[PDB]
Write a protein that binds this ligand. Structure first.
Ligand SMILES: CC(=O)O[C@H]1C(=O)[C@@]2(C)[C@H]([C@H](OC(=O)c3ccccc3)[C@]3(O)C[C@H](OC(=O)[C@H](O)[C@@H](NC(=O)c4ccccc4)c4ccccc4)C(C)=C1C3(C)C)[C@]1(OC(C)=O)CO[C@@H]1C[C@@H]2O
Ligand SMILES: CC(=O)O[C@H]1C(=O)[C@@]2(C)[C@H]([C@H](OC(=O)c3ccccc3)[C@]3(O)C[C@H](OC(=O)[C@H](O)[C@@H](NC(=O)c4ccccc4)c4ccccc4)C(C)=C1C3(C)C)[C@]1(OC(C)=O)CO[C@@H]1C[C@@H]2O
Ligand SMILES: Nc1nc2c(ncn2[C@@H]2O[C@H](COP(=O)(O)OP(=O)(O)OP(=O)(O)O)[C@@H](O)[C@H]2O)c(=O)[nH]1
Ligand SMILES: Nc1nc2c(ncn2[C@@H]2O[C@H](COP(=O)(O)OP(=O)(O)OP(=O)(O)O)[C@@H](O)[C@H]2O)c(=O)[nH]1
Ligand SMILES: Nc1nc2c(ncn2[C@@H]2O[C@H](COP(=O)(O)OP(=O)(O)O)[C@@H](O)[C@H]2O)c(=O)[nH]1
Ligand SMILES: Nc1nc2c(ncn2[C@@H]2O[C@H](COP(=O)(O)OP(=O)(O)O)[C@@H](O)[C@H]2O)c(=O)[nH]1
Ligand SMILES: [Mg+2]
Ligand SMILES: [Mg+2]
Lengths: 430, 426, 430, 426
């Protein structure tokens, strides 16, 4: 009952996975060899074998060996099943068409049957958690190949999707706009709730809240994983107001295509700061409505809120939460749509946020993850389709995609479909 | 797993190659005997990229050594690492190329290529998954320029989808040792623009400028120049040999680096570079590693990038470093220097980050610049060529090998077409 | 009561036998000298002499000395009766006609004399277990000479037959198609249930399940024997639902000539995976219906199932098996014929699978051997009669067979009789 | 138990034979005295295949030694292993064959064959079950070509159902020592095509090419060529002398190797072969052992198999190896080289695998190719023959022995019939 299959794709998805499974193991008290010293709280994320070893309900997929061979060699080599860690020979080269048409076309059969052997091992099944990069060749092209299959083989099941999305200024690739726009069909047609996240926004949160002047990716992935633990904590633990994975969607998603919430977490804080402020429910609730804590570089004040899920965990009480969201309704800078008079879905769970012992983030009695559908996110799309337009006006890299089996017209058909999503988020604000 | 086949042609290609094998054997911890003696499991994890296992745990590097004279094979085989190579992969003639492209391509190397290509097959069929070919040569003289581009043509026809990746030392006016250098290079660039997926353009004038104005070496030898080249050859493959925060295969470079198919003539560089008397006074940190790496003095071709614009730059960093600091510096560079990058590409810098810096360095960056300034290297060759060709000077040595005067017309025509395509985006 | 005479013919049958008798000795606790330290469980496979020595109910036959002289010299030299290890002077040369007409014609009346002296020591002999290669000269020609005699001498007794059959691509001989097609009269007229096995299918099972990158024949024979231990387990041991060797046939065989089941075994697993793997009754049942575990290179989804015998052994309970086969009836990719509404014969036996101590195959609480009559097997016949057709159109090797006393018309009469079997398996699917 | 009778004819047949007895005595662990001194029971288990047991546990080889001159008997009897043979089995004349086939077949050897054949009876009657005859000879000169094919005819008539298996060193244009080689060989091939069950075609040109290109021998003797031949002679009988995963008798080879009765002229080879300076650079494993075994440079007849197609290849492996790995490689070869195998046979490769590799190797493979390219070996001999015969040159030496000119017309007629049957299936 209440299982989730977690699929970690490309380097970004696998490295976020290596932080997610670092956290879930601590939170459930599972050793890095999969054993558990001394309730079924682990059952959402781990299959229990008769030997007394908890094996994760995960799949790790990359078209090249390097990152998963590191998972097969590091402290978690004993945890994972040796063929839920899946690797090809050939890198996708930041080319969507290698991921989707040419290279991922071979490994897909092995991936899909290893997913079947998890889904036939779940007694009921809540959904899929799919982790990837929008800018990658494996991230965009293999996830879009895999989701098209999962959306015919598992059509009823909720597909939740965690995406590292291109920034306003920070970028690692020249072709990041092409791979992201080609992905917009995947999220629109074959996903149920898609959590965009941005490297540059978390880099700024790290600088302001964690006091870390120059962070790596390990610092980022320890924030991105903490959101999925807080989304799933009601699926795993006792609470005053637990939220089911579809109860979540029935309050987040106002219209079939309007399923791109922002996400944020509070208190993101250094352990040295956390002694000198009290971090009450009202403080951490107000922190979620700061532009300073949004994990996509867009301003929520340039939008309207459609719905907010405030998923609290740890030592919080429904008195305090109602008294807090009453102050958020009083503030005229936080503007909801005219057609959502209720606005807030509240979840409250009794399990505090677990600290990764090597991490930068404080012990706190309370946290909230706020997941928030708002019109503002259309600016993160308006940034990136203006990067796409400069390059497609020249056909600037198109021969690498056409050379690997893609139709040239798919670039126009993807920029077109993105303009129809950017239309839909502007249309519902009125 | 992403095997590479490496090929050395002529004196220069075998000299930059025989130094490259000393550098990557130090990285992977391989002894001059061919035995492993390294510290770390990461050195052994990807040793298959450049080597074969052989009986008794000895390692055999996957190099083919090609020359039309025995004397460079004799100099490599007797050298610091000469015993490492397979005795059957030394493929050679007896009478040299005479510094003649047409001897390389039509006579002396056309005889020998049947004996080369069938060794390139035994190494490529012993690969588990070949990613590409890594060919070292010079565009002056006749062996590297004319036999090496014959061999590129033969391997391209046989392996059309694998990466063809060439390191190409090429002529310049102020550092020259051959009369017919312009002819040989113009006949050779005509093959590189059509067949290679990447060509890394290297200049002895720029390699002496690094030695004099950055390293402050009083008497830099060809052994010191070969050490600068081979550092950037080890640099660009690093991400298939070691783990990293951002992995980039040679193909992940090519997709980001080459906007239009033919604009693949890159210009490499390396950081840190210091005098041994100033390493005590400098910080190797990513901002100082970046200010050097984008310096017109640091790049290994005569083209001042200030005479053009970058289409793409790739910065392949190595070492324990912040992704914020790397992404900050690759942003700050192309915003503060925005007049030197093309403004129809919204981000001109690719980044990659390996977890394993070179032995004895805390950090390194290898730089690859695709720059419209590279027009000035093809232009100065084509203008040295023209003044000889208009009077048919020296052409009896090439037409004696059965080459047409029409092939010189057509190679110089194709050279001006390569210049026109870089000037177009400027 | 409940005896079986096991006849091991040619190199393949003798080397499978050297695995079978390695297994039966461990499983009954008999030393390799035939003694037993400290119930009649051994009685199906071993005669007991008054010294307390258990002698196998086996005949080993080869037309050349080399392989049986190795059995006469290795660790089992003291197990067998010295005159039931039977050898000629002259190899059959991969020529059916040397096995059947010229060389085996001399040894046959000595082979029968041993089988008579074994049958006269039985009391209610259950049947024969005949092990051979379809591609061999002794394998095809001597087995077909012997079976013709046993089918007049012992006409009532069930003749079960385990055949190493030619592969799609893997082959060891040029004339393997000729010897196999000439054998098709033997299996049709003088056999009661014929278990085709393929070297290339077991090589792929070994690669994917056991992770052994480059197996020998000793690895194949330790799976082919494990199937016959699992067929015979109900004859040797206590169970919840024991299956008799004719009860087996009454559920496997729908029509007199339709007696060519596939066979598969689960779990095929090694110690490095057994600890991460689930190994419940439902999983090892579903593994029998994967194309990846069939020991003939044909796809069961290109057929229809007529009947399945699921012969479970070890710690299973009829609750779990009924619940498992209910999921197999639910899956639309596993298609039975319209005329077999029951489909499944279930057997359940309390004795776990024995580990050969030198083997790759793991200790597991449960196994199932699934033996399965399906229309799909006709493709393994359609492969090989297309190899035959190219060579017989040239008469490509026919002078070696005509030169050793065979009628040339027997090649046409054998290709004809195979086309009538390949017709029968297509005819009953409708 | 599958005894072989071995027969040596002329200088070449007694020299490849007297080396073969040194090789199989090393395998079976037999001392030059004839006493057993080996390590292993497996060496002794099948000693009867090539030896007779005698008092004091001395073992005498089942060889018959035939010559028309005493001087090769004197050279064998005095040699490294000469004392091992039976004194009665040296059967010889006094006046030689004069390099004349008709002296061998009609005069000098027709006198001697009554004294040879009655020794072949004493050895064949001492056998428990004879499988065949293993005859070593040359097709040039007069003793091996003309007496050896007389002796094949006499043993074939007396033992019609036993395997007749011949190892036949034969002429080529660039390595020749006789004027009348084409005549002698054409008169001799006319007997081999009718009587033998297998004939292994061997060439001094190909045996020198293996010494130079791949063994890199500084100066190859006839003793070094005889060592290459005798390695393949020990190879093909291995499966009746040692245990294996797949056993193949000489008859199990013939049934698979010979599609149509007369197409039995094979082309042997051996692996590993490697220069003594290059062994350290190698992996011995089945994938690398295969890529040598099918190389046009490794086969012991002058034919490039790329000028034809194979009918059948047999690969008789020896050593501890995987059947998946052997069956994989013998598949990969004939699918990746499918233009070089006939496409009316659905699998062209026979495999066999013995558990006991040659002393001092971890693996070995002996190759047998039946190829339509062997037409080139009979075409070049028939074209040399034709030029001498069109003007009757040297024929008074043959017609002086009472031979007809009609027998030359009929032998070359039968040679062109053998060429036409191999060209037909191409
Ligand atoms: C204590 C200290 O800091 O030593 C340095 C050093 O002083 C300096 C000057 C080194 C030194 O470089 C030179 O002397 C040099 C001379 C001519 C041409 C090129 C280099 C050094 O020799 C070079 C050497 O580099 C390596 O060992 C790298 O692993 C390099 N491989 C080799 O140089 C090499 C040499 C012999 C045999 C095999 C390999 C490498 C570079 C890229 C990719 C792979 C490997 C290093 C760090 C140093 C010394 C030793 C003084 C420098 O080189 C490098 C690549 O770091 C030159 O400027 C840099 C900055 C360093 O500070
Ligand atoms: C230390 C080491 O590895 O020694 C090897 C060796 O270096 C190499 C080069 C050997 C060597 O071969 C030659 O020198 C050679 C020269 C001319 C013609 C043929 C061979 C070797 O001499 C040959 C010798 O082979 C044998 O001993 C076989 O059992 C062989 N029998 C004989 O050669 C033999 C010699 C004298 C008296 C009696 C027998 C054999 C071959 C086929 C079937 C049965 C037996 C071997 C392994 C080696 C040396 C000693 C260097 C090679 O030969 C063989 C058959 O393995 C040549 O290429 C291979 C690869 C080997 O590695
Ligand atoms: N937060 C974070 N972002 C990462 C991490 N790894 C990669 N990224 C982001 O991933 C984006 C690019 O995607 P790639 O890493 O190239 O995706 P990929 O699927 O491996 O692409 P291919 O190599 O082509 O298969 C960049 O914008 C990075 O910032 C990580 O561990 N954490
Ligand atoms: N699994 C397995 N297959 C074997 C074994 N030995 C032989 N085979 C198969 O046997 C087939 C050929 O039959 P042979 O081994 O030649 O049979 P044979 O009866 O000894 O033939 P003859 O020598 O002519 O008498 C090949 O396809 C082999 O793959 C073994 O021990 N195990
Ligand atoms: N970097 C470097 N350049 C070299 C070396 N040897 C020669 N060169 C230079 O580059 C050119 C190479 O041409 P060369 O290799 O001699 O022609 P080839 O032998 O016919 O191919 C020469 O004219 C030299 O200026 C060397 O060891 N290193
Ligand atoms: N391999 C090998 N070839 C030989 C040997 N002796 C001679 N030959 C060659 O092969 C031919 C053999 O002919 P030969 O045996 O002399 O004729 P015969 O004595 O009348 O049978 C000669 O012309 C030589 O070229 C030898 O010891 N080994
Ligand atoms: Mg990737
Ligand atoms: Mg046999």
């Amino acid at each position: 009952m209440r299982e989730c299959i977690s699929i970690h794709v490309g380097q970004a998805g696998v490295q976020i996975g290596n932080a997610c499974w670092e956290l879930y193991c601590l939170e459930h008290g599972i050793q890095p060899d999969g054993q558990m010293p001394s309730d079924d709280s682990f059952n959402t994320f781990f299959s229990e074998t008769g030997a007394g070893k908890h094996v994760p309900r995960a799949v790790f997929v990359d078209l090249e060996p390097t990152v998963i061979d590191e998972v097969r060699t590091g402290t978690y080599r004993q945890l994972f099943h040796p063929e839920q860690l899946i690797t090809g020979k050939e890198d996708a080269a930041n080319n969507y068409a290698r991921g989707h048409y040419t290279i991922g076309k071979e490994i897909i059969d092995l991936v899909l049957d290893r997913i079947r052997k998890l889904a036939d091992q779940c007694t009921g099944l809540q959904g899929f958690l799919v982790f990837h990069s929008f800018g990658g060749g494996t991230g965009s092209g293999f996830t879009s190949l895999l989701m098209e299959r999962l959306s015919v083989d598992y059509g009823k099941k909720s597909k939740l999707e965690f995406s590292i999305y291109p920034a306003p200024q920070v970028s690692t690739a020249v072709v990041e706009p092409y791979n992201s726009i080609l992905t917009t069909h995947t999220t629109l047609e074959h996903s149920d709730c898609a959590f965009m996240v941005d490297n540059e926004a978390i880099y700024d949160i790290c600088r302001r809240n964690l006091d870390i002047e120059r962070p790596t990716y390990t610092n980022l992935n320890r924030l991105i994983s903490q959101i999925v633990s807080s989304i799933t904590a009601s699926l795993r633990f006792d609470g005053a107001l637990n939220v089911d994975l579809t109860e979540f969607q029935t309050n987040l998603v106002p219209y079939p295509r309007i399923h791109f919430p922002l996400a944020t977490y509070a208190p993101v804080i250094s352990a040295e700061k956390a002694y000198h402020e009290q971090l009450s429910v009202a403080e951490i609730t107000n922190a979620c409505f700061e532009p300073a804590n949004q994990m996509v570089k867009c301003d929520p004040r340039h939008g309207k809120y459609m719905a907010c899920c405030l998923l609290y965990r740890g030592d919080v009480v429904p008195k305090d939460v109602n008294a807090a969201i009453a102050t958020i309704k009083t503030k005229r800078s936080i503007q909801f749509v005219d057609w959502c008079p209720t606005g807030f879905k509240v979840g409250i769970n009794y399990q505090p946020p677990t600290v990764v012992p090597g991490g930068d983030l404080a012990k706190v009695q309370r946290a909230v993850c706020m997941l928030s559908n708002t019109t503002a996110i259309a600016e993160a799309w308006a940034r990136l389709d203006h990067k796409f337009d400069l390059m497609y006006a020249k056909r600037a890299f198109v021969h690498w995609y056409v050379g690997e089996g893609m139709e040239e017209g798919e670039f126009s058909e993807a920029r077109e479909d993105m303009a129809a999503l950017e239309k839909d988020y502007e249309e519902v604000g009125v | 797993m992403r095997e590479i086949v490496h090929i050395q042609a002529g004196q220069c290609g075998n000299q930059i190659g025989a130094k490259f094998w000393e550098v990557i054997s130090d990285e992977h911890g391989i002894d001059p005997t061919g035995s492993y003696h390294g510290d770390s499991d990461l050195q052994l994890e990807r040793i298959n990229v450049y080597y074969n296992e052989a009986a008794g745990n000895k390692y055999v590097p996957r190099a083919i050594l090609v020359d039309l004279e025995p004397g460079t094979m004799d100099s490599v085989r007797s050298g610091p690492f000469g015993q490492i190579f397979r005795p059957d992969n030394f493929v050679f003639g007896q009478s040299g190329a005479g510094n003649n492209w047409a001897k390389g391509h039509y006579t002396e190397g056309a005889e020998l290529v049947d004996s080369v290509l069938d060794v390139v097959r035994k190494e490529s069929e012993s690969c588990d998954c070949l990613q590409g070919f890594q060919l070292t040569h010079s565009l002056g003289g006749g062996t590297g320029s004319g036999m090496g581009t014959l061999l590129i043509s033969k391997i391209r026809e046989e392996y059309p989808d694998r990466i063809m990746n060439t390191f190409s030392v090429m002529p310049s006016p102020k550092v020259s040792d051959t009369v017919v250098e312009p002819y040989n290079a113009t006949l050779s660039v005509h093959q590189l623009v059509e067949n290679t997926d990447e060509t890394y353009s290297i200049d002895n004038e720029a390699l002496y400028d690094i030695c004099f104005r950055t390293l402050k070496l009083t008497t830099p030898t060809y052994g010191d120049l070969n050490h600068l080249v081979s550092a950037t050859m080890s640099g660009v493959t690093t991400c298939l040999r070691f783990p990293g925060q951002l992995n980039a295969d040679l193909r992940k470079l090519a997709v980001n680096m080459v906007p239009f198919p033919r604009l693949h003539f890159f210009m490499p560089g390396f950081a840190p570079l210091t005098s041994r008397g100033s390493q005590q006074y400098r910080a190797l940190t990513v901002p100082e590693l970046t200010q050097q790496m984008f310096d017109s003095k640091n790049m290994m071709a005569a083209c001042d990038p200030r005479h053009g614009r970058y289409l793409t730059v790739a910065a392949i960093f190595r070492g324990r470093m912040s992704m914020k600091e790397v992404d900050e510096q690759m942003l700050n560079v192309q915003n503060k220097n925005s007049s030197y990058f093309v403004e129809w590409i919204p981000n001109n810098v690719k980044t990659a980050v390996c977890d394993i810096p070179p032995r004895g360095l805390k950090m390194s960056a290898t730089f690859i610049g695709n720059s419209t300034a590279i027009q000035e290297l093809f232009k100065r060759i084509s203008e040295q060529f023209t003044a000889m060709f208009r009077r048919k000077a020296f052409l009896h040595w090439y037409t004696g090998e059965g080459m047409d005067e029409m092939e010189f017309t057509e190679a110089e025509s194709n050279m001006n077409d390569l210049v026109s395509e870089y000037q177009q985006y400027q």
